[PDB]
Short mmCIF file of C-alpha atoms in Angstrom, two decimals:
data_model
loop_
_atom_site.label_atom_id
_atom_site.label_comp_id
_atom_site.label_asym_id
_atom_site.label_seq_id
_atom_site.Cartn_x
_atom_site.Cartn_y
_atom_site.Cartn_z
CA UNK M 1 -134.99 156.87 -26.25
CA UNK M 2 -131.61 158.51 -25.59
CA UNK M 3 -130.33 161.69 -27.26
CA UNK M 4 -126.53 162.08 -27.36
CA UNK M 5 -125.33 165.56 -28.28
CA UNK M 6 -124.48 165.91 -32.02
CA UNK M 7 -121.17 167.79 -32.25
CA UNK M 8 -119.56 169.31 -35.35
CA UNK M 9 -116.67 167.03 -36.31
CA UNK M 10 -116.27 168.63 -39.77
CA UNK M 11 -116.69 172.33 -38.92
CA UNK M 12 -113.27 173.13 -37.44
CA UNK M 13 -110.50 173.44 -40.01
CA UNK M 14 -108.04 170.75 -38.97
CA UNK M 15 -104.64 172.31 -38.15
CA UNK M 16 -101.96 172.19 -40.82
CA UNK M 17 -99.50 171.26 -38.08
CA UNK M 18 -101.70 168.21 -37.50
CA UNK M 19 -101.38 167.16 -41.15
CA UNK M 20 -97.72 166.51 -40.41
CA UNK M 21 -98.88 164.36 -37.48
CA UNK M 22 -101.45 162.38 -39.48
CA UNK M 23 -98.88 161.82 -42.23
CA UNK M 24 -96.49 160.77 -39.43
CA UNK M 25 -98.93 158.18 -38.12
CA UNK M 26 -99.65 157.13 -41.72
CA UNK M 27 -95.99 156.46 -42.52
CA UNK M 28 -95.55 154.91 -39.07
CA UNK M 29 -98.41 152.44 -39.47
CA UNK M 30 -97.27 151.66 -43.03
CA UNK M 31 -93.66 151.15 -41.92
CA UNK M 32 -94.59 149.00 -38.91
CA UNK M 33 -97.11 147.01 -40.96
CA UNK M 34 -94.61 146.37 -43.75
CA UNK M 35 -92.08 145.52 -41.02
CA UNK M 36 -94.52 142.89 -39.75
CA UNK M 37 -94.99 141.59 -43.29
CA UNK M 38 -91.23 141.38 -44.02
CA UNK M 39 -90.40 140.01 -40.54
CA UNK M 40 -91.98 136.71 -41.67
CA UNK M 41 -90.23 137.19 -45.11
CA UNK M 42 -93.15 137.59 -47.50
CA UNK M 43 -91.75 138.42 -50.95
CA UNK M 44 -92.96 139.72 -54.31
CA UNK M 45 -94.66 137.43 -56.79
CA UNK M 46 -97.40 136.97 -59.35
CA UNK M 47 -100.69 137.30 -57.44
CA UNK M 48 -102.00 137.30 -53.87
CA UNK M 49 -102.12 133.78 -52.44
CA UNK M 50 -101.15 131.63 -49.44
CA UNK M 51 -99.87 128.35 -50.94
CA UNK M 52 -96.70 130.28 -51.83
CA UNK M 53 -97.85 133.44 -49.98
CA UNK M 54 -96.88 136.28 -52.25
CA UNK M 55 -97.28 139.83 -50.99
CA UNK M 56 -97.14 142.31 -53.91
CA UNK M 57 -97.88 145.42 -51.76
CA UNK M 58 -94.40 145.77 -50.22
CA UNK M 59 -94.32 149.30 -51.60
CA UNK M 60 -94.95 152.91 -50.50
CA UNK M 61 -98.38 154.53 -50.21
CA UNK M 62 -97.45 157.29 -52.68
CA UNK M 63 -97.45 154.72 -55.50
CA UNK M 64 -100.86 153.56 -54.27
CA UNK M 65 -103.84 155.51 -55.56
CA UNK M 66 -105.99 157.88 -53.52
CA UNK M 67 -108.59 155.07 -53.11
CA UNK M 68 -106.30 152.61 -51.25
CA UNK M 69 -104.69 154.58 -48.39
CA UNK M 70 -107.65 156.43 -46.84
CA UNK M 71 -108.93 153.21 -45.24
CA UNK M 72 -105.64 153.23 -43.27
CA UNK M 73 -105.60 157.04 -42.85
CA UNK M 74 -108.62 157.26 -40.47
CA UNK M 75 -108.50 154.41 -37.89
CA UNK M 76 -107.85 156.79 -34.95
CA UNK M 77 -109.02 160.32 -35.88
#
């Protein structure tokens, strides 16, 4: 019954200055999230669990593939 205006989210070329900002928020959310994970001293191990509570992804996002980080890249854009 309503008709909100469709706007062009994809048309404008996003600024290359902003790519520094989105990489900044990406490293910031990764660093703060890993800081949360290490603050309660989760360590490396065999597999993901809770009985010992391994955490094998205490690592950068560059080592992670393209199809792991983009879920964390667009929570706010």
